[PDB]
Design a protein around this ligand. Sequence first.
Ligand code: MG
Ligand code: MG
Lengths: 199, 200
Amino acid sequence: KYSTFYEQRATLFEELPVTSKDIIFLGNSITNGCEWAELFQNKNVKNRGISGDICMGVYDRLDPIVKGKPAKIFLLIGINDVSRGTSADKIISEISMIVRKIKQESPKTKLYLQSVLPVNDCYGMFNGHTSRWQVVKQINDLLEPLAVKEGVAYIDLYSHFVEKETGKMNPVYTNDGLHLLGKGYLLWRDIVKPYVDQK
Amino acid sequence: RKYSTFYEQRATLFEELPVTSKDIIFLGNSITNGCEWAELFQNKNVKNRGISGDICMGVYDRLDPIVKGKPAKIFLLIGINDVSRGTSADKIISEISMIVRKIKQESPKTKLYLQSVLPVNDCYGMFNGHTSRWQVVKQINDLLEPLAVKEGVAYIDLYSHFVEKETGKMNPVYTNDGLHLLGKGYLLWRDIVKPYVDQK
Ligand SMILES: [Mg+2]
Ligand SMILES: [Mg+2]
């Protein structure tokens, strides 16, 4: 069904309680990679990232997050569905399933849909991901209208990470064309801190 | 290449995250990286300095952004990826000794805890370079506890709680691959190490 690493993380998350004060970062490797409470100097921020995760993988593990009725969920997902050849509209339909379930199970949770980050094939790594760099904007052009339809926030990380001239991630933020260096996380911190702190 | 790029991702992140005199650092490889330590201990002072794929000299090489903050405690778990490279228990211990002496020199007030290398199990046919070397885990631990005594630091026997009967292999209840931990595995680690974390 899913990877052994997914099972390790998911079974750990089943043992860690979520409370009404928690601010959850939910996603794939790009979420897994950070120390979120340290980045925000906020003990209420928690990591629910799993390297390799896909939209259906996130859907399938919502229960141990939404049952705690967290204050906030920041979602960043879809780039591993891109590497499977799934079209943008199909990915957005799956993200709609996630948003609908969070709203139904925990209506007081503030949900923030984060733009899929750009990617770059310059490093010749993750070719399934980085060769489909044009799908990122395709997703984001449909994700912003989804947010507006469902009454949830859309956060444009993408415009801060992209190079205008290429449509690809600025190499200053990555060593592989997909994941973030520390500088990358500091930029994400600067963009989303006002939303993390908002009442 | 994926381990080398992931190391630089995590290391460069840790260079941007300040360490303070209250902090309790979990330092190691994937088995440290895989936890949410502050959630496990319900303790905002506990921080993750784990990097999947890391080896003893990769931990040595990135001590500066941890020891400069003079943390209260460092819990070290390292070595199994050196085992998987065919490196001898003796050479592994020599590199752990380098880590211990550098921590003591740079941050003498830091309490250092050397955690037994965890057992492994070849029953899932995964990570063969690791799991087929299950006998090297006790070879290291039999030298690691004397090293802890010689350097005046704590040795933490996790291994005896995780190992099955007298097979010298990890109990499959704690793992789905013979190397890494399920949530149940981190709860056992929590139960063993919480009294050390809680030390005044
Ligand atoms: Mg770069
Ligand atoms: Mg098992």
